[PDB]
């Protein structure tokens, strides 16, 4: 078997992306955030506190001829943003794109903070990292892809997200009309449960190329890119008048400035984010002072190749026995 589905930005940064979901009998279409750093598919639901729902199209599992209930199951995760929430937990029948996963558990919230409440356009999170992150007690779950794999053509998902515009998750089959060139693949570690590896280096604009271990994860469900202090220090420092601010929480720059591209190693390929992917536009209403694509990952403790840095490439999530990413240019 096979999906493919469309996923389209929020808003006009492409702070994340939404892909519609088919859950239950009769089916209820809900916009989930895939999340390649995370392995709970959680929504927002008719148990929800009403209060902390305010636009999002909610799961009522009691009008799913298909759902039951996880009895005694919980869940509660804590997102790298500070954001959480937490409920129980139905199994249900799940479809996207067209492949569909019967008994797939689908947690359902009790309580979301506020950064998902006033997010009307994200109806809940569909992780893709791997099953030792999923939250669910006390009988872990597994995610949908790794329910989906053994029937998929191949044990693969991709992620081929837009500037600006739509894009595309695969399952169980590589477009090979969706990049130019070749795609370059890479180990993973699966030690913390996420889609790690280690680019071989980066460069600024038409700059040298630096060569250099970068150890991080590729994350679809994280905005920006954010890398050691060292290399963002560097990337910053090509811009007039750019600035870590710590009134903002990162790096400024004039919205006058025309930024330069940032590339990034895999292997001994490279993959060039455009300037313009690294605009985010005001701080705030009017402002002419705009926020940066590239952050520090310093007291993050990881690196995070996010959306800015996937957009810029098709990117293969590669579930085979020994995982490994590939990237190519598109």
Do not use: M
Request: glycine residues 12%; contains cysteine; proline residues 4%.
């Amino acid at each position: 078997s096979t999906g493919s589905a469309t996923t389209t930005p929020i808003d006009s940064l492409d702070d994340a992306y939404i892909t519609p979901v088919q859950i239950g009998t009769p089916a209820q279409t809900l916009n989930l955030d895939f999340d390649t750093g995370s392995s709970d598919l959680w929504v927002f639901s008719s148990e929800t506190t009403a209060s902390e729902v305010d636009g999002q199209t909610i799961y009522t599992p009691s009008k799913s001829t298909t759902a039951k209930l996880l009895s005694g199951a919980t869940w509660s995760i804590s997102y790298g943003d500070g954001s959480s929430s937490s409920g129980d937990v139905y199994t249900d029948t799940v479809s996207v794109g067209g492949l569909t996963v019967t008994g797939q558990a689908v947690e359902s919230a009790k309580k979301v903070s506020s950064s998902f409440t006033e997010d009307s356009t994200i109806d809940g999170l569909l992780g893709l990292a791997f099953s030792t992150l999923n939250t669910v007690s006390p009988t872990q779950q597994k995610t949908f892809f790794d329910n989906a794999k053994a029937s998929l053509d191949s044990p693969v998902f991709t992620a081929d997200l837009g500037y600006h515009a739509p894009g595309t998750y695969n399952f169980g089959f590589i477009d090979t009309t969706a990049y130019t060139g070749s795609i370059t693949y890479t180990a993973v570690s699966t030690k913390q449960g996420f889609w790690e590896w280690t680019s071989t280096g980066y460069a600024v604009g038409s700059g040298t190329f630096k060569s250099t271990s970068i150890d991080g994860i590729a994350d679809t469900g994280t905005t920006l890119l954010y890398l050691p202090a060292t290399v963002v220090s560097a990337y910053w420092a090509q811009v007039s008048g750019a600035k870590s601010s710590s009134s903002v929480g990162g790096y400024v720059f004039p919205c006058s400035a025309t930024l330069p591209s940032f590339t990034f190693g895999v292997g001994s390929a490279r993959i060039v984010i455009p300037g313009d992917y690294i605009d985010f536009g005001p701080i705030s209403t009017g402002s002419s002072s705009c926020f940066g694509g590239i952050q520090s990952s310093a007291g993050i403790g990881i690196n995070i190749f996010g959306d800015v840095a996937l957009k810029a490439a098709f990117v293969v999530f590669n579930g085979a026995t020994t995982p490994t990413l590939g990237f190519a240019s598109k």
